[PDB]
Symmetry: C3
Subunit: 362 residues, 3 copies
Amino acid sequence: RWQRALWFAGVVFCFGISAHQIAMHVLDYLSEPVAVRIDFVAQNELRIPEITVCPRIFQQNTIFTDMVEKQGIDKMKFLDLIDRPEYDIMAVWNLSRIFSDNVSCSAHEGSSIISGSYVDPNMSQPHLVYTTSGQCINIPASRPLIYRGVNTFVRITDSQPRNLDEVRPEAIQIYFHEHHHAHLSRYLTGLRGYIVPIANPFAFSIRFTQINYANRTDSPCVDSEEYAACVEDFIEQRIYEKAQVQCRLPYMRPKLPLCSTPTDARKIFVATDDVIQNFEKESSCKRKCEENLYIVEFMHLFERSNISIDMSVYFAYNYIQVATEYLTYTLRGLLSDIGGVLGLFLGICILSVIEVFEVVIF
Amino acid sequence: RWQRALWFAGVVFCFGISAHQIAMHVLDYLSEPVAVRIDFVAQNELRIPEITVCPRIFQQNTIFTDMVEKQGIDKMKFLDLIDRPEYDIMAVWNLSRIFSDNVSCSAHEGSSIISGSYVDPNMSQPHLVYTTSGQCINIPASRPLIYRGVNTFVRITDSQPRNLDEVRPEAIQIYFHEHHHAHLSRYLTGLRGYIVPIANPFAFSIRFTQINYANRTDSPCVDSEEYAACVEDFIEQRIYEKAQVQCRLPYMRPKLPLCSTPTDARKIFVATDDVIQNFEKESSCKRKCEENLYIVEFMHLFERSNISIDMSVYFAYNYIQVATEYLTYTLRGLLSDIGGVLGLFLGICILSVIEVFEVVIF
Amino acid sequence: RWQRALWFAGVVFCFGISAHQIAMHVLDYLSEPVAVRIDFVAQNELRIPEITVCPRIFQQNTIFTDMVEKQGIDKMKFLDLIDRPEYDIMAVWNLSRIFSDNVSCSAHEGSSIISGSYVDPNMSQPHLVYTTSGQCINIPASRPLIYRGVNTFVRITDSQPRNLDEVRPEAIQIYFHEHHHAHLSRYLTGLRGYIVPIANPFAFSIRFTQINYANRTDSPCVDSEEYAACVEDFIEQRIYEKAQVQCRLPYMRPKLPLCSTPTDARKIFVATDDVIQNFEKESSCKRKCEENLYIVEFMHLFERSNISIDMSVYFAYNYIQVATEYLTYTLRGLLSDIGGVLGLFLGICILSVIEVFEVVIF
């Protein structure tokens, strides 16, 4: 009657409400949330980002646009050089070289009260690499620099004749990146790189900022190497099935031969443009787990020296800011919260339920 | 006796202690706490901050101080020009114009392997606006720029005759802001702006940093439009009831006529000084819970071109860091914690209390 | 039998499992965790850091290396000047002076619509100080600046004759720090300082970033004064018991007399080099509680002025970022979690246990 019906109403209310927090909690766990922890890691071992230094983009490299303009053709159709036998595609892209074999890079990873900074030229030296911007110089930047103050930098230097033998380069295309399945150097140096002058001995300063992501079903991060493989493979696949040529330009993996004819080379170069401009959206592999960010500011520093190209890249801050996305609702939290909901919207305990089941079997 | 007295002591202890966590928890909820969560949003659509570009402040604009010094008066009392019929307040503030109708602004929101960057001059063009610093040029900067690398900028240019027709401006007052009820442009450009030289084609770089606040009773936020309206209304109200003049200068809203007499104009201009210097404290409206911060650093980049004013504003980082203040102790947390306190400092449950009340009515 | 044995099994399961969360919780509390909370404090009263401005390190001060070269002694063995009576160690380091009596510093902590910025030259003036780099100029930088916009800076100026009387200094060693037991100024200015040129009126910009650490048994922070005392005492102790000289150079506390002989002075100077290079690792007192970080960027700003040394230091951002490490598992959390574990892996409550003890004593 009255009392039993009201007891039934109370029990149904408690169960239904206790079925509205457990159901919501399980739905929350299924669509797992993610919070962000930000830390400031002070490390006395800074990992130099790989530096790709290119000319301007062929048509703006007023080294290449001069030699090409000497052969009866002009920048715009610079790729027609391949028509005549004595010019091949590799020669054309060597024609944009603005560096000179003696390109060095020292590591000034400290200072002293005598003899100023501590010079260390033993770090991996630059090597030439073919990029869509021409023939660039890539700094391996293999080992990490010991952070011994704000005067901790890498000085890249080139000493080609600075006299009136030819028009001299005005700009260079810097690009800071990471290693291995080279597409950052070979494709994206023209786009993501800073165009800076070389009239004066410039200086960069770089702060590091890592953005770690949480690997989860609805947004799976893939470590850097496989992301680079995804991006480069997609880029070349779209480049080949966009001109049907089945050939490569000097900035592409040695998969198929170098088609030495302007028409074919023109198709590949234009397809390269189209793909690299918008490879971000039509790719499939999502962001990396680790997302390094080099906040590159400009500093005046030291003073000048008479030399062709001087580039001091400073790392005056050792506090690499890390921002990590993480799973904030692991299963243990779900179990504990379900226990809490049952225990504070009902009378059920775990030992209570086990004893009830024991009584079930008597 | 012993047993019952000690049982009473235990029950009173449990209740009083269970009345010291629930009371403290409710006090904590009343004085709501606020925690800060920081995220790094990578957006490929960056919203340009509106740019107000002024001369130096009348007395430092060595365009205005030259024309005014030609009429028998000097900078300091430049506002006496109104005394003679042929000069009005609008003429005086047009006299400080350092720009030239052909002031343009292009949006270079990418690059290419051929044809360098992607020029897009269709974005909203600058318009002249009267500010306390003279007659400035405001870049509407309406639509957002697609972030296609570090070479994503807005190049504002002016090409007035760079020859010996008159003394030329040495520097300009930049100011990065937002839109609508214009007070940032018209009042605070002299104070909050970067004074940078125009001798060489300079370049800015802007990082974005949003600071969102939690709208709460003890610290309520008013969105950007309402904050701007509050601030500007207070500024002009205090400006008018500081000289009793009931007239305006060209940087004020068209409410009352223009101050066509030096004395009156001087009173309004000094009152503007006093108000804008310390309007932050004497206002009443508190901060916005959207608080955009433009970290403006300087970057060398590209090269020079023969042109009067060249200002490239770069947005080379697309990771807008957002620091959001939020309510960390919502009512649900209070209820759950009260339940926990009762259940682990007492024997009371929710279904238990419901059954007890049922027994109350039997 | 069956049912009692199964009840015993269930009770043992609940207790042991309830002994695997309470034990884990207590172990977690013992090795206390620490989370980082980050806030963006908008401070309208900025505490400018102390600035030590030195020449380059003796051997690069082409003021000192010129005067020494005039006495038949060359840079590298500049410390042999002590051999003759006319030169003592104090004179040798007064000989590296690149500043001149009238070294002033103004505080431009605002702007106005008339008369440009608000000049406040009353703030504490620089004083000369003996450092390992020679005789530097230290800015007391005592009181804080009122942040009245982007144009809030400290302008340090020196107006020594800028004519052909002697070879002029070309760059200087800046260093931003804090106060009291001076070792940052006297030892670490050569190492941690920015080498920037003085050919043109340069400008710095300082963003503040505090990193507060949580004082805890496994990593105890010490206030700034105590850390400075630790570092300086260790540095001087290692310096003295590295040459056995029992004498000091002008950059050391007035404990023992000055080394008036080249051999002794050279031993101290090399010992200072060795200690300051690697005092970070062989010290004992760990990091400070507060860790102020001055993100030092460069700006072009205002314009040029004819003066020997001009150094504007701008504080254009008032949002001092703070990252505080804190104890996230205080004892109250441990007690509450133990209560939860008992209540949802058992039937035990606090009032339940108190009543059980009541029954025990009857």
